[PDB]
Structure formats: C-alpha cells, structure tokens
RNA sequence: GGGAUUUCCCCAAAUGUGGGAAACUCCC
C-alpha cells in the first residue's frame, strides 16, 4: 500500500510545512497524461513550478512517456526531473489531483525502479585514463 | 582538495534521477 516502496512524501519529515525535505529526489512521477502528451508538453507543463532538468547529451529535458506493454501506446504515465529539488516537492503537492489536458492527473516523488529489481543502472565503455 | 563550464564513448524498452574518461577557465 501507500505511495511507493519508499512511501512517497509520507516519511519525508517537515514536508508538511516546507517545500524542501528532499535533495536526492528532484524527480517526480506522473499519471493520467494520456496519449495527447509528449516531452515538450510535460516539460512545458511542469516548468511553471521550477526549471526542468536537462540531459547531459540529448539536450532535451529529462522526461519519458511510459507505455502499455500490452498494446505499445501511451499508458498515461511519465517521469519529469526537476533541475531543483524544492520544485519537485511543490510540483507533487500542486499537480496531484488537477488536470493536464482536460483529464485528471496524479504526481508523486520518483525513485529509480531499476534499483528495486533490475539491479539499478550500470557503466559502459568509452575513453579511458591516459587517453 | 571541492564546486561550475566544455568535450568524447555505449544498449533500450522499462516502465521513476545512466555511467566512465580528458582538457581549459573561473570561484572557494
């Protein structure tokens, strides 16, 4: 039960009187988007709370719209990373329960799903020392 | 010693913040 396996902003501490109480959680998860949404829509929809974090090589904001594995189209889930941690907590308390394009949506903290089953992320080849 | 900037390399489905390496300048 609860928000997630980390419990959402439930154990965050002073998050009831402050928009901080986080630092390693500048990311938020979103639900209810629908198929009408895209990277430019989410980032342009969330940026009003604070700046969306940019990827270090793709140049786009750090977003991805998730899809149904049973049909291969938008599930209505997405994940938006904020460039600032206090903007993520505010965007959760704010966007959760309102609409996005006419349909209702939800928002919560986000934490890498891979660290809970896929063993988390992994390194890859490239340049090396003395190169 | 630390922080910021720049550059280079790699798979994609899995669903929620990728890693490694090099250089210069600036700030503490």
From Swiss-Prot:
Modification sites for Phosphoserine: 18, 81
Site description Breakpoint for translocation to form FUS/TLS-CHOP oncogene, residues in chain: 7-8
PTM section of the record: Phosphorylated in its N-terminal serine residues upon induced DNA damage. ATM and DNA-PK are able to phosphorylate FUS N-terminal region.
Superkingdom of this protein's organism: Eukaryota
Cross-link (Glycyl lysine isopeptide (Lys-Gly) (interchain with G-Cter in SUMO2)): 75
Residue positions where Asymmetric dimethylarginine is found in the record: 118, 124, 127, 129
Segments forming domain RRM: 26-112
Effect noted on mutating residue 53 to Q: In a breast cancer sample; somatic mutation
Tissue distribution: Ubiquitous.
Subcellular localization, as worded in the UniProt entry: Nucleus
Residues with the Phosphothreonine modification: 27
Function of the protein: DNA/RNA-binding protein that plays a role in various cellular processes such as transcription regulation, RNA splicing, RNA transport, DNA repair and damage response. Binds to ssRNA containing the consensus sequence 5'-AGGUAA-3'. Binds to nascent pre-mRNAs and acts as a molecular mediator between RNA polymerase II and U1 small nuclear ribonucleoprotein thereby coupling transcription and splicing. Also binds its own pre-mRNA and autoregulates its expression; this autoregulation mechanism is mediated by non-sense-mediated decay.
Subunit relationships: Self-oligomerizes (via N-terminal region). Oligomerization is essential for chromatin binding. Component of nuclear riboprotein complexes. Interacts with ILF3, TDRD3 and SF1. Interacts through its C-terminus with SFRS13A. Interacts with OTUB1 and SARNP. Interacts with LRSAM1. Interacts with SAFB1 in a DNA-dependent manner; this interaction tethers FUS to chromatin. Interacts with MATR3. Interacts with SNRNP70 and POLR2A; these interactions couple RNA transcription and splicing.
Disease annotated for this entry: A chromosomal aberration involving FUS is found in a patient with malignant myxoid liposarcoma. Translocation t(12;16)(q13;p11) with DDIT3.
Family: Belongs to the RRM TET family.
Descriptive protein name: RNA-binding protein FUS
Organism from which the protein derives: Homo sapiens
Name of the coding gene: FUS
């Amino acid at each position: 039960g609860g928000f997630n396996k980390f419990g959402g902003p439930r154990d965050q501490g002073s998050r009831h009187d402050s928009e901080q109480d986080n630092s390693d959680n500048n990311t938020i998860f979103v639900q209810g988007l629908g198929e009408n949404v895209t990277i430019e829509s989410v980032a342009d929809y969330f940026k009003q709370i604070g700046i969306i974090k940019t990827n270090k090589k793709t140049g786009q904001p750090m977003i991805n719209l998730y899809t149904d594995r049973e049909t291969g189209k938008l599930k209505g889930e997405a994940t938006v990373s904020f460039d600032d941690p206090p903007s993520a907590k505010a965007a959760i308390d704010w966007f959760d329960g309102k609409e996005f394009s006419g349909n209702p949506i939800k928002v919560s903290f986000a934490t890498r799903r891979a660290d809970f089953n896929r063993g988390g992320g992994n390194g890859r080849g490239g340049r090396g020392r003395g190169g």
